Amino acid sequence: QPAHLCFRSFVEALKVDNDLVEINTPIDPNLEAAAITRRVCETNDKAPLFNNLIGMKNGLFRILGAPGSLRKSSADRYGRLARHLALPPTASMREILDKMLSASDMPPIPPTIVPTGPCKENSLDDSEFDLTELPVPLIHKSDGGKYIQTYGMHIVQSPDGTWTNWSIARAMVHDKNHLTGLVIPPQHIWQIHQMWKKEGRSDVPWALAFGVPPAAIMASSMPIPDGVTEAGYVGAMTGSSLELVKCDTNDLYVPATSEIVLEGTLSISETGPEGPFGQMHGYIFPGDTHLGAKYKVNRITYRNNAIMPMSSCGRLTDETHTMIGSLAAAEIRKLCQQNDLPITDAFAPFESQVTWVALRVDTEKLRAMKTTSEGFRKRVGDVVFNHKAGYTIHRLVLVGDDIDVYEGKDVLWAFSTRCRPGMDETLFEDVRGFPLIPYMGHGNGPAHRGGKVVSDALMPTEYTTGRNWEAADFNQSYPEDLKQKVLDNWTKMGFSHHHH
Amino acid sequence: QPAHLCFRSFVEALKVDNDLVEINTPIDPNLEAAAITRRVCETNDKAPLFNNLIGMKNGLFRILGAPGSLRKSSADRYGRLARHLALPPTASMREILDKMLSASDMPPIPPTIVPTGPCKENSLDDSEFDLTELPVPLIHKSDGGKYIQTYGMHIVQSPDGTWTNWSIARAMVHDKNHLTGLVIPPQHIWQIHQMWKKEGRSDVPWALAFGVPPAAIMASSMPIPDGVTEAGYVGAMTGSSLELVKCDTNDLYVPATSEIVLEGTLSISETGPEGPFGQMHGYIFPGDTHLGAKYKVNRITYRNNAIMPMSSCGRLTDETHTMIGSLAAAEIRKLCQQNDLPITDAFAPFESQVTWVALRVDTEKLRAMKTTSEGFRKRVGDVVFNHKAGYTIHRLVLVGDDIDVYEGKDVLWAFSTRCRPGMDETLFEDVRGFPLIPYMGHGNGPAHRGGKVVSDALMPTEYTTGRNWEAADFNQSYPEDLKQKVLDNWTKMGFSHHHH
Numbered sequence A, B: 001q002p003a004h005l006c007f008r009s010f011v012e013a014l015k016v017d018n019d020l021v022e023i024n025t026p027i028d029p030n031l032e033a034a035a036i037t038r039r040v041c042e043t044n045d046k047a048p049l050f051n052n053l054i055g056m057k058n059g060l061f062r063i064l065g066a067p068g069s070l071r072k073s074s075a076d077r078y079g080r081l082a083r084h085l086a087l088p089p090t091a092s093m094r095e096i097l098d099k100m101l102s103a104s105d106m107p108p109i110p111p112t113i114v115p116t117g118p119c120k121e122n123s124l125d126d127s128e129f130d131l132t133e134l135p136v137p138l139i140h141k142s143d144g145g146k147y148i149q150t151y152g153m154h155i156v157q158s159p160d161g162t163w164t165n166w167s168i169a170r171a172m173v174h175d176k177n178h179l180t181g182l183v184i185p186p187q188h189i190w191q192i193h194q195m196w197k198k199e200g201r202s203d204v205p206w207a208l209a210f211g212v213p214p215a216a217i218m219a220s221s222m223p224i225p226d227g228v229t230e231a232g233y234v235g236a237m238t239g240s241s242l243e244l245v246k247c248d249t250n251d252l253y254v255p256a257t258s259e260i261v262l263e264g265t266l267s268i269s270e271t272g273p274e275g276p277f278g279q280m281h282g283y284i285f286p287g288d289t290h291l292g293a294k295y296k297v298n299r300i301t302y303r304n305n306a307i308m309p310m311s312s313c314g315r316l317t318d319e320t321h322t323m324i325g326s327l328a329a330a331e332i333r334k335l336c337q338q339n340d341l342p343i344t345d346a347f348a349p350f351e352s353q354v355t356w357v358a359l360r361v362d363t364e365k366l367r368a369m370k371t372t373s374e375g376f377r378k379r380v381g382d383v384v385f386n387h388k389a390g391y392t393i394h395r396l397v398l399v400g401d402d403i404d405v406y407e408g409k410d411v412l413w414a415f416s417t418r419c420r421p422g423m424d425e426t427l428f429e430d431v432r433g434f435p436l437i438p439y440m441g442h443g444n445g446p447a448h449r450g451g452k453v454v455s456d457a458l459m460p461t462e463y464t465t466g467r468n469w470e471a472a473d474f475n476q477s478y479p480e481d482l483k484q485k486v487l488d489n490w491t492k493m494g495f496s497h498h499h500h
Ligand SMILES: Cc1cc2c3c(c1C)C(C)(C)C[C@@H](CCc1c(F)c(F)c(F)c(F)c1F)[n+]3c1c(=O)[nH]c(=O)[nH]c1[n+]2C[C@H](O)[C@H](O)[C@H](O)COP(=O)(O)O
Pocket: A149, A150, A151, A165, A166, A167, A168, A169, A170, A171, A182, A183, A184, A185, A186, A187, A188, A189, A220, A221, A222, A223, A224, A279, A280, A311, A313, A319, A320, A323, A324, A391, A392, A436
C-alpha cells in the first residue's frame, strides 16, 4: 500500500528516506522514549522508532516519535509532511497547504467498506487487556498521566448518522479500561458530544485509531468545516476511496490498516481527572488537573507488531507547530478568500509558537477596495476571530506582497518595522479565546474570551498608490548586473550547497 | 599600538584573526564596495578591505567594510566587537556591554595632548581637495548622495568648553567643500548645536575623524549621559588616557592615529538637501530628501595609505544592529537600575530590527515590591521612554529570570506566550518617538510622538509567589540523569563542534 494510505508503509518510507533511526535495545516508556523524541524535535533529527519498549507484551506496542516534525535540511525541511500526502519530499509549505485545501472544492469520495484488514490481526476483549499494563509513555516529567493518545484519530458520529468526524485530541490512561481527555468547544468532538448529551439516551459510540493512513491524520488535524466527514475529504484529496473496516463492538468504521484500535464509548455523564499536559506553547503547569471527558474502552484490536505514533510536544518544533498551526493557517486563507478578502497566503510563524498567523495581501486588489487600515483590520478580524478556524490564533499580522509569510524572519521584519503599536492595531475582546495559551488560562484576564489583535503591517501607500520603498538589502538595493558580478566573483575574491 | 587604541592595528588584528578579506583588484565605490559589504553582513562573512578603490588618489582612500558586524561561528560571534575593546574574541554580549558600562562609575581619565601623530602625515588645504573627486561610496542604489560618513566620529564642543562630544551621525557629500547630514533631537550633536545657535555668534567648530581608536567609536555609538565627555569615558574604560592632537585650523583635538580627519564648521544657519539613507530598519524611501545640517570642510589631514571604515547598513546584521541597539540596551539596563527597578539585563533583539528591548527582571526583587503588572509597566515605561537612552526603542518586553534576553528565540517565545495582547500592555502616546522607523515617519500617525508600548511577558505568579511552570523542553521536562544518558547514547543509538 502507498505511504500516504498506510502507516506501516509510511514508516518504511521514512527508513528508505534515511529519515528514521531504529532503536532495537530496551527503551523505557517512562520518560526515556519521549526525551529522545523531544531532543529529535529540538534538533530536527531523524524520527525515532522504538522497537524494544520496556513493558511491550502480546505485540502492544512499538513507538514512532516525531512523525510530523522537521528535517534538518532546507531542501526537504517538510519532507515528513510531504510523505503524509504523496508529495515529493522537497515540497514547499505552500504546496502542502494547497494539497490539504484541494478537496474543499471537490465532491467527497466516500469510504469503501471492506470485510477485514490488518487492524484485525489481533484482539483483546474486556477481560484480557489492562491499559495500565501497556507501555504507555510518560511524555513530560510533570504530566498528570500517561498520554497514550497524542497522534491517533478519534472517530465519533452525529446521532443522525450524517456526519462522521475524525480529529486528534489528547487522552491519558485513567484506569484499566478508561481514558480521560480534552473535549472542548468549539472542537468537532465537543460539538458531536453535545448532540448526544442533548438527546440524553446513551453514551457516544467511539473509536480511537492509532497509526492511521497518514493522509487521514493530516485531515484529523485540520479544521475543515462543520458537518464535513473527514473520510470523504481525504478521499477527494487523495483521489481514492479510503478502505474502512467495521468495529467489532459498535457500528463505527476504522481504517483497515490502523495499527491499534480502541473501541468503546465517550460518556455523556462521567468525567475524571485529566492533565496537566506539556504542550504546544511550550509549558506544563504541574498540578493543573481538571475534570475531563471520560472514555470507556471495551475492545482493542491491533496489527501484528503494532506501532503507536507519539508526539513529544512542547517547545519548537513538533507536530503541534507543523500541523496544527499550518493547517489552521491554510483554512484561514480559504476562509478569508471566501469572504472576499484579498489574501493570497497564510502561515502561522513558528517563532510565535503558532499563536500568530501572517496574512499576505494582494495589494493591487486592496488598492481597488479604496479602504483604510482601521476598516480593513476590523473586517479581517471579524471574519477570522468569529470562526472556528481562528480559534487558536491570537494575533493576525497583515503584510503586503513583498513578504513571504512562510519565512518567519520576513514576517518579523515586517511586523517590527511596519506596524505602529496601538495605532495600527485593533484589539478584539469579545471573541472566543484559546485558554491553552499561558497568558489566557494562566493569565490576568478571562481564560475563554478576548486577548486577540489584528496588527496591520501594511504601509500607508499600500492602500493608495503602491509600495514607496525599496529594501536596504542585497536583493533590492543593487542592480541585477552588479549582484550577479558580486556572486560570480565571491569565492574568487576570498569569501565563503542547496541540498546540504 | 594595541588594536583597541589604533584603527590601523585593529585592521591587523582582523587579518591575524582570519576575519579579513583583502581585495587588491579594482573595486568601484559606486555601489560595488557596498554591495560586497552588504553581502558580508547578510551572511556573517569576513570583513572586506578594499585596497584598490577606483578613484583613490593621493592616498585617499582604501575602505574597510563591516567593521562591527558578526562572525559566522557561535563561539566568536561578537569577536569584531570584542576586538574594539581588548576583550577575548569569545566574549559574550553580556561581557561586551559590561565593559561599555564599566566607566559609568569610574572617574574619567582625561585625554593627553601630543604634538603630532599619524593623522598628520598628509594634508590638503582649501585649494587642494574636492570632496566630489574622492572615491566616496554610493552605498544603496537609491541613496540621495554619496555617504562619506557612516563610521567616523563627529567632534563638537559646548560653547563654554566644558563638554566635548564624540558621536556617529550620517553625512553625505554636498559639494567640493561641504557635507550635509542628520542632526536631530535629542542627540548630543543636536544639543550642542542648539547651544551655539542660541549664542548666535558663530558656526560650530567641528571635526570628523574616520578610523579612530576602536574603543572610541564604540563610545561614539553609545548614549552615555548628557554633559559627559566621551574621551574621558573611553579613558576610564580602557584604563589609559587617549592621545589626541590639535586640529590645524581649530582648537579641537582628534585621536592621534585617526586615519582621516576633516576640519571645519557645522553651520548654525545653513542647510542643504540630505538623504534618503538606506538604514538600520532595512528601508530606503527613494526621493525622500529633506533639509539637513550643513558642514563646511576647510582642511583634510590623513595617514599614509588611509583607510575609511564604512557601514553598508540595512537588513540584518550590521553595525546599526550590533552597536546601536546593543549599546542603547546597555544604557537602558543601567538607567533602570539607577531608578531602583529590578532589571538584571537588557538587549535589543535583532529579530525586532533593534526596535524592541527585552528587560530581564529579578523576580525575587519584584515579589518583594508587592506590585502589579499595570503599575510596574507604567513605572518602567515612564523611566525609559522619557530618557534619551530609550529614544530609538518602541517596545519594551519584560521577562522573568528564566529568559536569556541575549537569545532572540527565547525572547520571542516569552513574548508570544506570556504577554496577552492589550491587557498585558501599556501604550505610550505622549513620549518622543523615533521618526526613522517606517511606521513612524512614513506611517499613519505623528512622526515624532508616541507609538511606544511596554509589553509585560511576566506571568502572574512572578509578582506573587514564584514561577509555577516548567518548560516542555528537553532541559526542563526530564531529570538530569536521564538527560545525561540520552546525550551520552545519542551517537550510539544513530542520531547526529562548539568552535565550528
Ligand atoms: C496534531 C495535534 C493536534 C491536536 C493535538 C495534538 C496534536 C499532535 C496533541 C495531542 C499532541 C496536543 C493537543 C493540542 C490541543 C489543542 C489544540 F492544539 C488546538 F488547536 C485546539 F483547537 C484545541 F482545542 C486544543 F485543545 N491536541 C489536541 C487536543 O488535545 N485537543 C484538541 O481539541 N485538539 C487538539 N489538536 C488539534 C486538533 O486536532 C485540530 O484543532 C483539529 O482541527 C480538530 O478537528 P475538528 O474538530 O474535526 O476540526
